[PDB]
RNA sequence: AGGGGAUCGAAGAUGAUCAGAUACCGUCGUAGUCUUAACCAUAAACUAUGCCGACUAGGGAUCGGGUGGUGUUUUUUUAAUGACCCACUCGGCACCUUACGAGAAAUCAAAGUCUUUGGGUUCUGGGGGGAGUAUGGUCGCAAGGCUGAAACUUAAAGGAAUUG
RNA sequence: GCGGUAAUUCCAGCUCCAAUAGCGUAUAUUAAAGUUGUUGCAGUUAAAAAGCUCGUAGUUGAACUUUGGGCCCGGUUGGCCGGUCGGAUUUCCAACGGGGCCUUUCCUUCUGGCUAACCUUGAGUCCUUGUGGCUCUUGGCGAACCAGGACUUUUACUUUGAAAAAAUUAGAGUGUUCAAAGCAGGCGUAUUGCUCGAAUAUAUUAGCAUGGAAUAAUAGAAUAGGACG
RNA sequence: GGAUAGUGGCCUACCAUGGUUUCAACGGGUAACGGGGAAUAAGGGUUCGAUUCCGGAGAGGGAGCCUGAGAAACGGCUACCA
């Protein structure tokens, strides 16, 4: 596959047939929901809180140890922010590229790839707002991202 | 649609030959009158508790349900008591074997006994020339609002 | 390839490849038919008694001729390792 | 699978760039168009009368080297002016000019027939009689 | 993007048989793909298959001997009016007396005789000789 | 070739292969309980860092991550699982 | 429309050459060539070969990432590192030999799995010439771009290979 | 392609061929044509991949949710016998279908009408040592659809059926003397009738009706504003 | 509300701003009446139907209408154009 490219890496987590275990895992449940909403608490992503708790702790999988997935946890606890992990990224990059467009616009390289990023946005958008978790009237346009990711 | 003002008509509004008598002395007002379809179709509460006098309301009105009965996706409530609805098909072509996505958007009155929006699949039933070109009449809603307040705010 | 009541009829039932089971045709002048011979006690070796494989020209061609007839010939008892199920 | 899409319900596609193909076809177009009708000295009829202005002696193309016997004729339903090859040998002795002559195509549809340029049509009958029968013996160019 | 899963199957099998193998790792697994593999071994055209189960869509191992010259799909599963499936057999089989048009009915996956005898029809999926 | 073993595949040529097109796929990458002697407590580390993991207690470091593996800083010790 | 204008250098003038030589060769040299702000939108813009997916065959290199080694080499004190060696694995730019298979052939791991004819999908072509012409529409300051006929004519035009 | 002095193509004689009460021709159309390609084309060099990437309409779109076992009921061919005065039905038996079952298993649901079917049995038995066999009312099966009240996520596909003019087509019967046709006709007591017919099939798309539950869509309980009581 | 044998923007009055469209509206072309059908025989198709049956439309072009159960009739009338 691959959208905006035609590289065809493959690159990946090979997941485990182990459904359940770590059996060498001790601790809880309540340990590791702990962990995960304190860090939430402190503002970092499920991607930012599961790496670095599959690293310097010992949890394999936050779901398995614990059958649920970490935004469902954060969201559970009242921890969901505004819009999505992906989605704000790409809304993010698409800003800095922006400013970078506005400090030379002689750089066409860079409107091609903000107008790649921003069709990413708007087609991601389009799936979000198909499943009712953003309002179906949602829209990105750059001048009012700029303020909604700050 | 209709909503408010009832009697907003240059002409009075009242349903025909349904008398209610000034002396004698009523708790309800005005008297009103009702049936019902048939072939399965409830007679919606809003319809019998309701004020409004629509001549071309199923329920209520001076019409009567017979013929086809259809349904479809609503498209267009922007007129007054009463929509368009898309429906869609496929058409079958012999040559290639093989089906191709068409439609047809039929006009259907709508009594205020309903509350439609653009979206709300709805059965109509087939009556007699209602106007221009409405053949049908909106005779039950099965959808309800697509899900809308699952689309609310924050936390 | 009989008729109405029994009776076999048309001629001429080919071999096959023992590898793959694909018929041996006429024009496969590449195709092939080894024998190995059913020795006895001591040494020799009964002239007149085969065990016969046939090994058609495709295999041949695509060089899978040696390791099919190790294959074949062992679980066909007469040999002993040399070729494995597994890889 | 190259190109044409294979789906169940791309009938409409399919038959759409069935039609917009049709029109490489040189006689879907022509019979399309109307150009039977359009061009052609012919009206799209089969056969066409018209009288004969002059006797015209057209030299053969290459490599043939004579001179092919025509007249110029001006059709009556429609006016137009087409030249056609007299048949056999003489029968432009059969005309003489301002008669009144039968023409039939050549078989080709349109096209130039053998080494003639430009004739596309052919004598049948003068005078209301046969050519053939003319040719023969077996009947007379009438009165005049 | 992986289009048909069965005809993915089917190319799998038939590329192994042509190339002279006896066994085919095939992938990813489903029902339609079991039901198929299944009408083909009913008439001895593969030995058998196993379904090895990777914790996502699955994974087969089809044993097959050399019986097959060709199995296949037919891309838009068709909807055959049971006057229709004599036309199909006819289209892409070697001969009257044996091979099998295979299709889905409202009777389950089956094969054009089975489906003949039951007396249902349906949708048209692939073909074995 | 021709013939062959698809569902029982040698340990030796299973290990070659990419973690994907194993038979059943899987990972390759383990968890090891790690420590350095400054403290008394062991704390368990993934194998590919990411995140530059310190111990319990000390501020001290423990590993520091690359293209791939953790780099393991120099003073301390590990045990797989 | 400004700057810039070393160089080479459509135009143009010249010396030669030739029957002629508006050329090829020599000299002079305008515009150009560079850059800024706007245009313009085409190249044999080519691998003359659409994209996503599956499968079918062997070999040695090389780029990038990773892993494995009581391999070499760097010495300091053994390492750490850095380069190299070897085996393996992804994803690359390519070659090699093959040919089960394809082709009209030249050739082709796709141009294969195609009369045993169906993975999904976008585009184009239907004898040659007339002709990318005419007409309309649209785009551009212009040069011109896109969209794009017919009448008539014609038995061939064309591709790959073989012998001469 | 023939003809420029020996023309196997012209003008003719002879001889011969082909079709034959008919044969030529011109125009169109169909087949040949896999040269319009759904079936089924072609696009390196022959006609043809847009300079490139985005991208809407459109076409298309991974896998996974009742699978597996047990029992009954009655059909339709066919085999080996025939029991019989060409065809017949039992059981012996396989084969291939359908219906209903119990396996945690809505079948819309109440409120009675209806009950055909048995867990029933009430006496026993014609009769093969009896689960071979069904007439037979008193505790005990719902769905077979009745009518009334109360509600139901929507589809595509496929089956069977109804509704369906004739002529036309496919096609049965009848010797217009044959035949294209026609729907006649055929038989005796041919002096006071007798009688077979005037079939069947297709008739698709859409609408109705009915059985199916694979394939492929669709809807649902996450800010529980959920499920039944 | 009027008008009709009667439903209806069929017409009038008041009032609103709606109705169709790349699933191709609207417009143009047709040497276009529609169907039962016909020609061509591997199949899928291609082509055609003015014409013995059914439905529609017209009576040189247009409108208007009398009579009547039924006609906007034309082997009826009235007016205009040819
Ligand atoms: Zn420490």
Redesign the interface.
Same mark, same amino acid.
Do not use: C, M, N
């Given at each position: 596959?691959r959208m905006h490219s035609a590289g065809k890496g493959?690159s990946?987590? /090979?997941?485990?047939?182990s459904?359940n275990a770590p059996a060498?895992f001790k601790l809880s449940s309540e340990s590791v929901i702990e962990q995960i909403v304190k860090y939430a608490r402190k503002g970092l992503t499920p991607s930012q809180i599961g790496?670095?708790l599959?690293?310097?702790?010992?949890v394999?999988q936050a779901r398995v140890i614990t059958g649920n997935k970490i935004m469902r946890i954060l969201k559970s606890n009242?921890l /969901?922010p505004?819009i999505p992990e992906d989605l704000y990224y790409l809304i993010k990059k698409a800003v800095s590229v922006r400013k970078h467009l506005e400090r030379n616009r002689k750089d066409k390289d860079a409107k091609f790839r903000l107008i790649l990023i921003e069709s990413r946005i708007h087609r991601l958008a389009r799936y979000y707002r198909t499943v009712?978790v953003?309002?179906?009237n949602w829209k990105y346009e750059s001048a009012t991202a700029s303020a909604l990711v700050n | 649609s209709t909503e408010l003002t009832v009697q907003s008509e240059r002409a009075f509004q009242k349903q025909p030959h349904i008398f209610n008598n000034p002396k004698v002395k009523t708790s309800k007002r005005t008297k009103r009158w009702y049936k019902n379809a048939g072939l399965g179709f409830k007679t919606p509460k809003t319809a019998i508790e309701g004020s409004y006098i629509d001549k071309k309301c199923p329920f209520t009105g001076l019409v009567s349900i017979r013929g086809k009965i259809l349904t479809g996706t609503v498209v267009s409530t922007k007129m007054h008591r009463t929509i368009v609805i898309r429906r869609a098909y496929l058409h079958y072509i012999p040559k290639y074997n093989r089906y191709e996505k068409r439609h047809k958007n039929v006009p259907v009155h709508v009594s205020p006994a309903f509350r439609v929006q653009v979206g709300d699949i709805v059965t109509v039933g087939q009556c007699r020339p209602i106007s221009k070109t409405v053949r049908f009449n909106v005779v039950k809603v099965s959808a309800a609002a697509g899900?809308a307040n699952?689309?609310f705010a924050?936390? | 390839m009989e008729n109405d009541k029994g009776q076999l009829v048309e001629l001429y039932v080919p071999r096959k490849c023992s590898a793959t089971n694909r018929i041996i045709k006429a024009d496969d002048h590449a195709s092939v038919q080894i024998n190995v011979a059913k020795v006895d006690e001591e040494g020799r070796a009964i002239p007149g008694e085969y065990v016969t494989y046939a090994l058609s020209g495709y295999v041949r061609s695509r060089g899978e001729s040696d390791d099919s007839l190790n294959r074949l010939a062992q679980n066909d008892g007469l040999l002993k390792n040399v070729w494995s199920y597994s890889r | 699978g190259k190109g044409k899409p294979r789906g169940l319900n791309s009938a409409r596609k399919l038959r759409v760039h069935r039609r917009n193909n049709r029109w490489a076809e040189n006689n879907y177009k022509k019979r399309l168009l109307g150009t039977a009708f359009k061009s052609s000295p012919f009206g799209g009829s089969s056969h066409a009368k018209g009288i004969v202005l002059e006797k015209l002696g057209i030299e053969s193309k290459q490599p043939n080297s004579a001179i092919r016997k025509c007249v110029r004729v001006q059709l009556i339903k429609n006016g137009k002016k087409v030249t056609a090859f007299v048949p056999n040998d003489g029968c432009l002795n059969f005309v003489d000019e301002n008669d009144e002559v039968l023409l039939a195509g050549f078989g080709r549809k349109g096209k130039a027939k053998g080494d003639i340029p430009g004739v596309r049509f052919k004598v049948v009958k003068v005078s209301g009689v046969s050519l053939l029968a003319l040719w023969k013996e077996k009947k007379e160019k009438p009165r005049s | 993007?992986r289009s048909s899963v069965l005809a993915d199957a089917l190319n799998a099998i038939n590329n192994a048989e042509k190339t002279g193998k006896r066994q085919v790792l095939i992938r990813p697994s489903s029902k339609v793909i079991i039901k198929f593999l299944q009408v083909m071994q009913k008439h001895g055209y593969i030995g058998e298959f196993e379904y090895i189960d990777?914790?996502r869509s699955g994974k087969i191992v089809v044993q097959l001997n050399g019986r097959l010259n060709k199995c296949g799909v037919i891309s838009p599963r068709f909807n055959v009016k049971i006057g229709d499936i004599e036309k199909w057999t006819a289209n892409l089989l070697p001969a009257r007396q044996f091979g099998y048009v295979i299709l889905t009915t409202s009777a389950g996956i089956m094969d054009h005789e089975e489906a003949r005898r039951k007396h249902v029809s349906g949708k048209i999926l692939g073909f074995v000789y | 070739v021709l013939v062959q073993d698809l569902l029982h595949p040698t340990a030796a040529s299973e290990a070659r292969k990419?973690?994907?097109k194993t038979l059943?796929?899987?990972?390759?990458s383990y968890?090891l309980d790690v420590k350095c002697p400054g403290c008394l407590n062991i704390?368990?580390?993934?194998s590919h860092?990411?995140?530059a993991?310190?111990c319990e207690s000390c501020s001290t470091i423990l590993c520091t991550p690359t293209g791939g593996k953790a780099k393991l800083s120099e003073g301390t010790s590990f045990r797989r699982?």
């Open positions: 596959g493959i990946s987590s /090979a997941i485990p047939y459904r060498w790496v670095l599959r690293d310097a702790h010992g394999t009242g /969901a505004e009712a953003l309002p179906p | 899900k699952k689309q924050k936390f | - | - | 993007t990777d914790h | 990419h973690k994907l059943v796929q899987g990972p390759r968890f704390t368990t580390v993934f860092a990411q995140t993991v310190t699982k």
